[PDB]
Symmetry: D2
Subunit: 252 residues, 4 copies
């Protein structure tokens, strides 16, 4: 009952971190709208969790997002929290292998999709004194190799979170982001599968953290519920969920 009576939209909530965030909010008492461009995971999640419903939505399509917000209000009558989790990490790419075209397409998902849903949701979040939670990445803050477009998109998300927090503070709407490090998700597994030695890639990813393991979607989910339900004096913060990967010296 930490977030009972509240309505939450989670983009990319069909699998991975997003699904962990969906489950955490449902466990907190909220009703959750699962937004995803793929039907498979989200539809099954809606059958599994009472209180969660699935709405097909590609956050890069402005009309999809308009319909997502209006359907959320029509079906549930309020909107308290938007979790902008939809995003993608391309396979490793040397800077000379990247293109302005691919960069624009990644900006469209990782940054403008977050911008568009937030914009459409804010009138309702103002009515509810709701809040926005953006899922950025640690590599937005510290960089990463062979990921220039991805890193740039998460740098923008983290900075945009702070700008929006300033604009919305007079209306009592908080805007925060979570920066996960290595979290074991289908995306991580897919990316590891492309490497010459997948098992070696995964063990390298585990040892990137002083804790010696990757994180779980449920741990990102707990951080999100905290920001929504108990962080009333937090706005514009970047909550690190990284297992300490940013600490100390390492083999670079």
């Amino acid at each position: 009952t930490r977030y009972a009576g509240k309505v939450v939209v989670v983009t990319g909530g069909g699998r991975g971190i997003g699904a962990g965030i969906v489950r955490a909010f449902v466990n907190s008492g909220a009703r959750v709208v699962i937004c995803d461009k793929d039907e498979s995971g989200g539809r099954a999640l809606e059958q599994e969790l009472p209180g969660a419903v699935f709405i097909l939505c590609d956050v890069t399509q402005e009309d999809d997002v308009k319909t997502l917000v209006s359907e959320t209000i029509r079906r549930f009558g309020r909107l308290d929290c938007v979790v902008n989790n939809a995003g993608h990490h391309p396979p490793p790419q040397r800077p000379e292998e990247t293109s302005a075209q691919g960069f624009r397409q990644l900006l469209e998902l990782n940054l403008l999709g977050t911008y568009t849903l937030t914009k459409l949701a804010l009138p309702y979040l103002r009515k509810s004194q709701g809040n926005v939670i953006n899922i950025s990445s640690l590599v937005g803050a510290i960089g990463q190799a062979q990921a220039v477009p991805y890193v740039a998109t998460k740098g923008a998300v983290t900075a945009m979170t702070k700008a929006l927090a300033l604009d919305e503070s007079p209306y009592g709407v908080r805007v925060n982001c979570i920066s996960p490090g290595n979290i074991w998700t289908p995306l991580w597994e897919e990316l590891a599968a492309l490497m010459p030695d997948p098992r070696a890639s995964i063990r390298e990813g585990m040892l990137a953290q002083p804790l010696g393991r990757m994180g779980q979607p449920a741990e990102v989910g707990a951080a999100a519920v905290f920001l929504a339900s108990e962080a009333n004096f937090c706005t514009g913060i970047e909550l690190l969920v990284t297992g300490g990967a940013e600490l100390g010296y390492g083999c670079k």
Copy 2:
């Protein structure tokens, strides 16, 4: 029941932020040992809250701290979380009005007291896979005027938190800190009372945050319970509880 069956020590828990942290852990199901050098607030808190007990302890006295840990184990049989909140902010002091003597005494409370209890507690925290929460300050990160010794002590606490997180990660013991901004406490009120216009000082402190208010001990307390009970992939982080004071341009 988020932290049921767990045992928490809170230093400086007799009033202010520490008392808010005590109440939050008790509300989470934990048993809490209130450590304070002053009897008045802590003893009343123990009478008020079942599950909380008061132990007189000056964290600058190594034998006081040794007795605090041994009494906690003797009476409760385990130790899961240490919250190093004891600390003091002197009145405003121009750098030429400070002294090496006063600097050393402030280091003794704000930094070495935290170091001493953490050291004595870590053998028991390792047994429990417990965690350490240090209460630092936003001004450790961004500086503050007329507070050179205070700022230095909180810079050390925040850095020490990261060093300790690295050392204790192989043992599964997490070490994190909370950096509050302006929180309305008896200390803030006492400090405002020394100003020529106390009400003007307080309104200036409120407007330092884009949220337009100071924070509450209960909000620091919620952040502490989160770090202890639900932040299992967080170590070495600095959790800002500041109302956004660090964001954007201001009259400096």
Copy 3:
């Protein structure tokens, strides 16, 4: 003679910060290619400074940028440093007054133009063990009110700087950024002119810094020459040129 025999390209070098950076490199002994989309300032600068030449180039046009690099090599035979300074700050805009369209156009100048020139220049920078200097902004790090798209673009630039520094480090090519705060430029003056009271806006901007003044293009220029010529162990850093605006509490 600190940077004698070296060849530097400065985008947006016709006025403002870019012109200050041009002058600083010329004063250091380098030959400088001034890139700008407007002829007026850049052409006059080329007449004024021996060693500086002006090449008309809109960094949002990929063929313009291709021609800029090839003409630089054809005329000067090497390329040692690229300063990505072209950029624009729109007038204040509430988040609900922004558009995805305007956001994309600002990304095209502030981020993709930097990405495009850097990409085309890197083969030559690798030959010279040259370096990249991106002009970002303090508000990328701390946010700003009524500037969501602008803040996001500078957050991306600062993060991209770190990602690129990692990719190019094996080749001895350093990538750094400068984050200016309030610098008195034609852009600042133009923006102040739109305010109801321009003089009040300017005095507010001066007092945003503990130093009590805005910065000068020449001071950004000195920081750029340092990064190019004397910072051989610096890569991926964000050099703040802000007069301390990020320090301490302020009226927010």
Copy 4:
């Protein structure tokens, strides 16, 4: 002639980073007072460099520091820059192997010695519109294993730098710090000699940086001359001289 006619005091200037900073300022045209507790390196440096003189001074002894300032004024008539470089990194120590006693002694050198000279020098720095440069460490910001007291002292130095910058800004006195990463010095070599395999320790230290090498005292020296002579809009900044060690993921 970048800093001609100026007078600089460098503590711990007899070897290592301090000696590199001495040489850089002498090369810039300044007169430099070398302060060190050991006679060997400093006296030889004074014989080698016209314009540099050696004054025996232990920065932990307040009367030594008083005499250092008064002798500097008596012999050279002004004081423009103080570089607080004296400091020590103990051998690796697990947290349970540290002591409050050793912690206090390290605070006395790494933090209070910097505080004491800065305090005694500020009246003269105000007359000259001079500046303060503190040598902190990257591990103050990101932590380090087996170095809890050391990390805490550098966290304090970096924070104190910002507090002092705020206090001294109305007087036109800038206060900045440099945070080096792994720099090859006699201290690094001494520490490596204590390891079971010194050569393995050194190669690990080199690979901690994406640049693949450690830094040089001369590179720290160039950064110091920049801050003193050309960074007139920089105050309270932390200038990283780390070869990118803080960037990206590493084996932790």
